[PDB]
Amino acid sequence: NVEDDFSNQLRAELEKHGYKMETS
Amino acid sequence: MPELAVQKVVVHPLVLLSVVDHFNRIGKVGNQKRVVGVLLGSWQKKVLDVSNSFAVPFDEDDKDDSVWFLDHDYLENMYGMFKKVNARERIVGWYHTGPKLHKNDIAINELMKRYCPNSVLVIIDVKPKDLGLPTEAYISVEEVHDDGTPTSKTFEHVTSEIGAEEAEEVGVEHLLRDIKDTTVGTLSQRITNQVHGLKGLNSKLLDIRTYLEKVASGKLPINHHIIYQLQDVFNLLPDASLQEFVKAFYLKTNDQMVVVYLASLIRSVVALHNLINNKIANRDAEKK
Amino acid sequence: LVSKSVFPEQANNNEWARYLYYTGRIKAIQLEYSEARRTMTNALRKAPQHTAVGFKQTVHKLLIVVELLLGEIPDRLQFRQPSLKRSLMPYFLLTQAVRTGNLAKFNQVLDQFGEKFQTDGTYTLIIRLRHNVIKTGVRMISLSYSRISLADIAQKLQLDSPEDAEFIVAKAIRDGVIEASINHEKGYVQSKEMIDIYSTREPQLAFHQRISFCLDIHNMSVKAMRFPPKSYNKDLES
Amino acid sequence: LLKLFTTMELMRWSTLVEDYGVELRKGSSETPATDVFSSTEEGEKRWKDLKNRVVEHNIRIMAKYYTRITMKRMAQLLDLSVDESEAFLSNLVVNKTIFAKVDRLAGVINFQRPKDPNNLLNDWSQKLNSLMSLVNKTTHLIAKEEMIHNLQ
Amino acid sequence: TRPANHRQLTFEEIAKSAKITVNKVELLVMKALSVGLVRGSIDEVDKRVHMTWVQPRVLDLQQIKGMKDRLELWCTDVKSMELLVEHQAQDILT
Amino acid sequence: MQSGIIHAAEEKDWKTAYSYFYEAFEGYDSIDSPKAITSLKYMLLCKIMLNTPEDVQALVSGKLALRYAGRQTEALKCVAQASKNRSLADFEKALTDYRAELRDDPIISTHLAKLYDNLLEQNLIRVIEPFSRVQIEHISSLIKLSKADVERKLSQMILDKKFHGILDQGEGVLIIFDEPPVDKTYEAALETIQNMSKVVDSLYNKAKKLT
Amino acid sequence: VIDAFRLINANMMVLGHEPRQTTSNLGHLNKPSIQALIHGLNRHYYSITINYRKNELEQKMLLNLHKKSWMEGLTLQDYSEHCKHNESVVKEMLELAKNYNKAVEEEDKMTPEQLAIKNVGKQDPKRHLEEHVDVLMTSNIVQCLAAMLDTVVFK
Amino acid sequence: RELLKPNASVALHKHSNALVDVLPPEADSSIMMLTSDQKPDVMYADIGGMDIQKQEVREA
Incomplete structure (x- = not known):
């Protein structure tokens, strides 16, 4: 991990989709 | 006539100096006896600015505080000669030659009133005492106690300071083989005042302490007012100690070094190679 | 040999940096990670010089391994920027390993790397380094949270199993730099930290170290500043 | 009535309203409307308002004396319920009554500022000066008693 | 009696030396600060009475004795501390 | 006078609106008309928008403002006093009946609106200030707004740092943090570091040449 | 004379x-x-x-000026005020800092007229900084020392 | 030569004419800031007109 920004683009998209279907 | 009319006593270095001189000259009236003399300066005002002092003939018998001789003529004439020269000049009060406070002075104070309103007791000692001035200023205060007679005539100390005129101050320096020890000025003075406070604080605690033992056994007379005030110091007990710190100075020194070093470093590089050639130059320059 | 100790200020800038590094090695194996870190850091800093350049690369090799064992993390980013970059390169993998919290990556890389260190005699340290990554990891989790479950810590830090994870977290805790308690039969770690410098005296303590260090600079500066110009006036002023 | 209010001693509303109500109503005067303001037939309308005022006085004196207080102790001192005491406080600060940091959960109430190192320092600085002044003044008084006329 | 370098006494003793109804206690306690018998504050979230000042004991041989010993303890603190601080900043003095 | 109506409402300069209305007055003075009375009113409107209706209540009276014409003077008096009482009830009751007048002059409608949301904040700040860990329910009674509506308002206010607290949703209390405890020496210590930092950085780059 | x-x-x-x-x-x-x-x-x-x-x-x-130096040497103001002093100087010094930075390159030079352009000899940063540091230094130490010493003797 | 260098008042000794000391610029300014002890008799109650002129002067 040199910069969090590359990884973060995938994270935010992925995390929302899973989280939404389940709880939210 | 008012006793109450003092809360500040400012004295010139002249009056303080003057008493020392009068002791020897007067024919050494003092020791067991006392020399009290008039103080010339401002009066009829709150802050007392004492311009000068001179001796008055006095023979004191201390033990019996009802017997004394004081020169009646002296105050009147002396006030008139001085008035013309400076009209601020009046009879401010009288000095007492100590060694410290007494009850004998009470008796002495009453007669001073008829001549001039004053009752100010300045105790200017010719004998060195205190780390500071052996001068105390006292204003006669009336307080009730419940140990002895009700309503006593006593002295409460009122703050003493110093003055000096501008020429006169430079004169104070001229006589000394120093300037002064303190003034609470820069880095150096400021600390000297702190250690002077600390020694001065230790001297203060001991006067009170020694006295309580004596009351405890071997009885001395006491007042309700002094005993209470001492108790209060214990009761007031501080709270918590916090804050205050610096470090600023190291940057100032550090920046200063590189500016002076700039020249040095350059001189270093030139100087080393020059060192063998310099011997021929130095010799030549030195020769004639 | 070290016990004789003498080293004057009129010593050259290269001899100082060399001297600091050597001591730094001796300390680090004895298990003074704390003292070792300090001497080695001073060495890089004190001589920028020009004979130092050659030596500095050696200082950077040791710099990264000691500091990580003591419990602090640096960035790979810091190291890359100077032109002594070429010696820092395997080192970038190690810095990242400790920082992400990745026990498994960190030790395996270091075991193989251990050969290079042997010439120096740093190699005995490489073994101890397996522990420090887990410790660094626990430190970020402990400060951050209040009570966080045992399963969460095991996934992020890259611990071997949930059974490994309780024991190892405990060992860090004893030292007191982590300052937690771990509940084995309840499977959470609790933070004993409820830390703040909002207090009475405590900010002065923080300020105090900075203030102490400044004095050492001030005296060194004052003493040194006057002595060269007075000399040149005295002899050859150029 | 005068003696009580001027002293910084606190009251209870029950007693205050009860004993004074008959006594004060009787009073009269020349140039006012009747008398008005805790007195007469007119003055009674005014009386209702006093209720706020006896409680107002109580909190103003309480704030100094009880630096820290529980909601129940405060409520008791004031002679009100909890609910009356907390509502009133909001209006009171506007009228010019002290600062408080009253609780709804009946915890700590600081009529003084709530914990600061500055608060500890202010008292400390005050206390420090007093100790120094008193030891010096007493020293000067002490000598006289020692020497007497001249015989120690 | 209990304060003289301590400063707290519990609130609790007052009510045990009152023996009267609870509402009346607040009045008594506050009435004492006001007249000039005592100075201080009362803290009822610790249920203790803190006194800043406790009134000096009206003339006795005993009153004089209590004071002397405490003050002697203090006398020793000034002398020691004064000498200590003087060694360091020897240079600043000049 | 018209230009001032724009200045206050659209250009958000309460200051300009007022100055323009002085100019208008000067022009009116040479003659007299009912338009002179309106410019005095419109000055009054800026203060409301400024969020100080309380100041309007002091200036307006039955002796000074009611003597001059319009509905607008009676309309101004009631909103200023309603705000002074500090209740949403007194404030809404004035707005509703006045609303028809509010429409006629574009300046009244807009100025009151901004004051309306604000009115809520002013009632809360007042209650909250000499209270710590007080319920939303207790404060909500004085404002005369719902417990829930207040919860929302506190949240916003905490972000501005107008009282510096945190809203506890787990018990339904507004806990407000200790009064600033930061000593002057401590605040100075950050500052100390700025002075030194700037100097050493600048010095160190040139200094590099020596070794 | x-x-x-x-x-x-x-x-x-x-x-x-x-x-x-x-x-x-x-x-x-x-x-x-x-x-x-x-x-x-x-x-x-x-x-x-x-x-x-x-x-x-x-x-x-x-x-000696007076007897009262004994009390006075010890006497401190209010802590708040001491803490304020420290804060006031720091802010002052921070301003001067920018001016020091250009200066350091020389500012060992003779003549104030010449120095005015070169090393910012107009409102000289060395001098301003040295005065700020001297006053701040003596006051902070003496005020800390006094209060702390008195507290140990009295309590 | 700092705040001495540009045009300023300075103190000289009389009997020699020598430059003893410096003074700041504020010292020895001829008359004090006037229209606070010698204010005029006139307002914008003497002129309500010349509107364009009034607008201009106030801004400028």
Whole structure:
């Protein structure tokens, strides 16, 4: 991990989709 | 006539100096006896600015505080000669030659009133005492106690300071083989005042302490007012100690070094190679 | 040999940096990670010089391994920027390993790397380094949270199993730099930290170290500043 | 009535309203409307308002004396319920009554500022000066008693 | 009696030396600060009475004795501390 | 006078609106008309928008403002006093009946609106200030707004740092943090570091040449 | 400087009365009012030496300002005010800092006129910084020392 | 030569004419800031007109 920004683009998209279907 | 009319006593270095001189000259009236003399300066005002002092003939018998001789003529004439020269000049009060406070002075104070309103007791000692001035200023205060007679005539100390005129101050320096020890000025003075406070604080605690033992056994007379005030110091007990710190100075020194070093470093590089050639130059320059 | 100790200020800038590094090695194996870190850091800093350049690369090799064992993390980013970059390169993998919290990556890389260190005699340290990554990891989790479950810590830090994870977290805790308690039969770690410098005296303590260090600079500066110009006036002023 | 209010001693509303109500109503005067303001037939309308005022006085004196207080102790001192005491406080600060940091959960109430190192320092600085002044003044008084006329 | 370098006494003793109804206690306690018998504050979230000042004991041989010993303890603190601080900043003095 | 109506409402300069209305007055003075009375009113409107209706209540009276014409003077008096009482009830009751007048002059409608949301904040700040860990329910009674509506308002206010607290949703209390405890020496210590930092950085780059 | 003179005239001088007066004293040159003063000064005695009779006892009375230094040396204000002082200076120093930075490249140079452009000799940052550091230093230590020392003796 | 260098008042000694000391610029300014002890008799109650002129002067 040199910069969090590359990884973060995938994270935010992925995390929302899973989280939404389940709880939210 | 008012006793109450003092809360500040400012004295010139002249009056303080003057008493020392009068002791020897007067024919050494003092020791067991006392020399009290008039103080010339401002009066009829709150802050007392004492311009000068001179001796008055006095023979004191201390033990019996009802017997004394004081020169009646002296105050009147002396006030008139001085008035013309400076009209601020009046009879401010009288000095007492100590060694410290007494009850004998009470008796002495009453007669001073008829001549001039004053009752100010300045105790200017010719004998060195205190780390500071052996001068105390006292204003006669009336307080009730419940140990002895009700309503006593006593002295409460009122703050003493110093003055000096501008020429006169430079004169104070001229006589000394120093300037002064303190003034609470820069880095150096400021600390000297702190250690002077600390020694001065230790001297203060001991006067009170020694006295309580004596009351405890071997009885001395006491007042309700002094005993209470001492108790209060214990009761007031501080709270918590916090804050205050610096470090600023190291940057100032550090920046200063590189500016002076700039020249040095350059001189270093030139100087080393020059060192063998310099011997021929130095010799030549030195020769004639 | 070290016990004789003498080293004057009129010593050259290269001899100082060399001297600091050597001591730094001796300390680090004895298990003074704390003292070792300090001497080695001073060495890089004190001589920028020009004979130092050659030596500095050696200082950077040791710099990264000691500091990580003591419990602090640096960035790979810091190291890359100077032109002594070429010696820092395997080192970038190690810095990242400790920082992400990745026990498994960190030790395996270091075991193989251990050969290079042997010439120096740093190699005995490489073994101890397996522990420090887990410790660094626990430190970020402990400060951050209040009570966080045992399963969460095991996934992020890259611990071997949930059974490994309780024991190892405990060992860090004893030292007191982590300052937690771990509940084995309840499977959470609790933070004993409820830390703040909002207090009475405590900010002065923080300020105090900075203030102490400044004095050492001030005296060194004052003493040194006057002595060269007075000399040149005295002899050859150029 | 005068003696009580001027002293910084606190009251209870029950007693205050009860004993004074008959006594004060009787009073009269020349140039006012009747008398008005805790007195007469007119003055009674005014009386209702006093209720706020006896409680107002109580909190103003309480704030100094009880630096820290529980909601129940405060409520008791004031002679009100909890609910009356907390509502009133909001209006009171506007009228010019002290600062408080009253609780709804009946915890700590600081009529003084709530914990600061500055608060500890202010008292400390005050206390420090007093100790120094008193030891010096007493020293000067002490000598006289020692020497007497001249015989120690 | 209990304060003289301590400063707290519990609130609790007052009510045990009152023996009267609870509402009346607040009045008594506050009435004492006001007249000039005592100075201080009362803290009822610790249920203790803190006194800043406790009134000096009206003339006795005993009153004089209590004071002397405490003050002697203090006398020793000034002398020691004064000498200590003087060694360091020897240079600043000049 | 018209230009001032724009200045206050659209250009958000309460200051300009007022100055323009002085100019208008000067022009009116040479003659007299009912338009002179309106410019005095419109000055009054800026203060409301400024969020100080309380100041309007002091200036307006039955002796000074009611003597001059319009509905607008009676309309101004009631909103200023309603705000002074500090209740949403007194404030809404004035707005509703006045609303028809509010429409006629574009300046009244807009100025009151901004004051309306604000009115809520002013009632809360007042209650909250000499209270710590007080319920939303207790404060909500004085404002005369719902417990829930207040919860929302506190949240916003905490972000501005107008009282510096945190809203506890787990018990339904507004806990407000200790009064600033930061000593002057401590605040100075950050500052100390700025002075030194700037100097050493600048010095160190040139200094590099020596070794 | 106090000098005592006697005044004679020119006629007396040529007879040789004038040299007698001048003998046995140590000179010193003054000029507070041009050569005309100096001519009279030489003619008179020419700055006669004044010494002072004193003994150690009298000197000591003149040295100390008052008795009250004993209390006063210890006396501190309010802590808040001390803390304010520290804060005021720091802010002041921070301003000067920018000006120091350009300066450091030389500022060892003679003549303030030349220095004005080169190293910001107009409102000299070295001087400003040194004054700020001296006042801040002595006050903070003395105020800390006093309060802390008093607290241990009293409590 | 700092705040001495540009045009300023300075103190000189009389009998020599020498430059003893410096003074700041504020010292020895001829008359004090006037129209606070010698204010005029006139307002914008003497002129309500010349509107364009009134607008201009106030801004400028």
